[PDB]
Symmetry: C2
Subunit: 424 residues, 2 copies
């Protein structure tokens, strides 16, 4: 009865796994070099590009960006003579899509591709700041915590729609109103019919992220305008702030690096059989016996580069730092006090100085988890200031541990942000 879920999900993991393995052997990579998180992001980026096929549903590709329409690739890092060297592979999109498909027993693994996409998205969320893009749109920097999903493609709507946060939605809509406001043709014409229906869908997606009946119906008013302008702009900004106090309903799926799935199947793990869920202990324990490395930079804190990957693996960048901590097993500080610069490596980076380290990716527990303006305001005035944890070994919900939180500690991951700005 409950067999189907483990399988469709475990069978999804399996394929991501098989695919990674083949990909590594194909690339003549060593265990360490395969468990290198930087090589893993580069291999995932590669499968989505072929399935993307220039439609921005699976990839975040630029519009003017210079990359061969029928051939994807990325940087690979292998340790030779002790020094880390930067290699640059390039594969035929076919190789990727044929190898991917074969990894999945002839199926197009669309869940898998969405799983990897959401994982890159979670990482980005825990790594890059958005305030500079917020201000330019007319939004506020505090709206940074309504940003989950902002560096995701506007395609793969349901998935995007589930993981994206109010701000990401407000931000999207806010832009159309501009390009519509600015271009005269924008809402009239075949593009109005094509975009108007888009604009709308977006409103509904946003709308279905709100809880209070006032927010919901206010979005409706905003979507009923046939010529969105300054007025609808202030309303979305308004909704955007209401989200700060009356939190929305945003999905959060714990996706892990392919190398972590690829590493388990190759050790003998049979997922589709045992089964998988992203809800319970599966991603916690799979993370538990984790052995994921990372090129680390001169003067970076290995402990910190790890918090980052930890944080993205469990979808906790927008998580009250006191909640996360109780579960991590160690304080989970604000980005501002971190000392890494990202788990990527720039072309410009001097690899002569490059280091290598073992991410600490486990945890101490696992856990389960006009008139209107006025109605909303008050709902905010009256607003008031958690999840159930279980020891790893308590497979089932036999005994919920109580949380002993510390309420005097930093809760926000964004106050005093030090991260880079996500140009792309």
């Amino acid at each position: 009865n409950a067999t189907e879920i483990r399988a469709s999900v475990g069978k999804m993991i399996d394929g991501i796994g098989r695919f990674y393995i083949q990909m590594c052997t194909e690339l003549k990579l060593s265990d360490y070099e395969g468990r290198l998180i930087q090589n893993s992001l580069t291999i995932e980026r590669m499968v989505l590009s072929a399935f993307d096929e220039r439609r921005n549903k699976y990839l975040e590709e630029h519009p003017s960006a210079g990359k061969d329409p029928k051939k994807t690739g990325g940087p690979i890092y292998r340790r030779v003579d002790g020094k880390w060297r930067r290699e640059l592979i390039l594969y035929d999109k076919e190789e990727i899509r044929r190898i991917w498909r074969q990894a999945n027993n002839g199926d197009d693994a669309t869940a898998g591709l969405t799983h990897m996409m959401i994982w890159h998205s979670n990482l980005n969320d825990a790594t890059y700041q958005r305030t500079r893009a917020l201000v330019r749109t007319g939004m506020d920097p505090r709206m940074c915590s309504l940003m989950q999903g902002s560096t995701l493609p506007r395609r793969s709507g349901a998935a995007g729609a589930a993981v994206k946060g109010v701000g990401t939605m407000v931000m999207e809509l806010i832009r159309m109103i501009k390009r519509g406001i600015n271009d005269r043709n924008f809402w009239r014409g075949e593009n109005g019919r094509r975009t108007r229906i888009a604009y709308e869908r977006m409103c509904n997606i946003l709308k279905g992220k709100f809880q209070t009946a006032a927010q919901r119906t206010m979005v409706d008013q905003v979507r009923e305008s046939r010529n969105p302008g300054n007025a609808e702009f202030e309303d979305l900004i308004f909704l955007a702030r209401s989200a700060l106090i009356l939190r929305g309903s945003v999905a959060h799926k714990s996706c892990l690096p392919a190398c972590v799935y690829g590493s388990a199947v190759a050790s003998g793990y049979d997922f589709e059989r045992e089964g998988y869920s992203l809800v319970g202990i599966d991603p916690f324990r799979l993370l538990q016996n984790s052995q994921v490395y990372s090129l680390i930079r001169p003067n970076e804190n290995p402990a910190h580069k790890s918090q980052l990957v930890w944080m993205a693996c469990h979808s906790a960048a927008f998580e009250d730092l006191r909640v996360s901590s109780f579960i991590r097993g160690t304080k989970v500080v604000p980005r501002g006090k971190l000392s890494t610069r990202g788990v990527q490596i720039a072309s410009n980076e001097n690899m002569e100085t490059m280091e290598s380290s073992t991410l600490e990716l486990r945890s101490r527990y696992w856990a389960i988890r006009s008139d209107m303006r006025t109605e909303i305001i008050r709902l905010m005035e009256s607003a008031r200031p958690g999840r159930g944890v279980f020891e790893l070994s308590d497979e089932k919900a036999t005994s919920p541990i109580v949380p002993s939180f510390d309420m005097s500690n930093e809760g926000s991951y964004f106050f005093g942000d030090n991260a880079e700005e996500y140009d792309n």
Copy 2:
């Protein structure tokens, strides 16, 4: 009761005013040039430099600074170096030959009040093992190492916590008393029983320990919810005062008070011009100044916005860089505009053992505006605020980092 304090301060304003007028003449600037903010800061800094005399109590060959005089359609960066005694002598003269201890500390807090709305210190907080969120407890954080009991009056909970922590962390007879003293000040900043206590116990620890690093850090955090009582002092540029007296206004006799409408009315009718780099928003540069004048950086933006009459945005939205100029900024990309230093309404300053369980327990659990025309506080407007608007001047702070 009232009359003396209001006079004695009044005489201080008058002193600065005069001192500024005079120096204005030795430096021989035109009315416009004499109303330029950078010129007021540069003469203001001289006065303090001289009287300080390398002890780090006021301002951190001779004393000098940049003098901006516009001829004949570009501005020039004049760098004058004046005698340190010629300047302080001139200060005595404008003050009847009296040390304006109050007068000097007044211009000082003004600069502190400026730096406060202009520079971010989150970076120093973190280097000291503090919270960024503690950024709104940094009043007077940019005050001199040797700052008296008037300035320390203008110091925030986090400024004292920082100062204290930076000392235990530093090595690991009079440092003791000193470090006991700071603890006393911090103490006079809390409003509750338990908050005071921990401080006592803190200055009380026989030898500095990690318990305080934590205990101070913990108290610094309580002040964020259990607001304390840090003294704010509305201090205006010297130009503003100088000008006023040139008007003939006679502060010593009319009486002045920073606790009231005075600082406001003097600014309402006060005309200051500032240099403005290119692509900067004169209105934001004005916000910056207005804020510093009323000593309102750590104030809730909604209350500030109400009083001002116009939105007072977060420093992360401010299209400015600062009120000073470096020796590397082209003067042929410079020009000036008027600093809008007015307000819609004027307000009252609202003149003001497990300790962690009392504290935490507490934690979990009328500044009225009046028309500028209502001098006597005869009618109180109940500010109608909107909590949709932003309250923290600091979230997203992109401001330059001050370096202590």
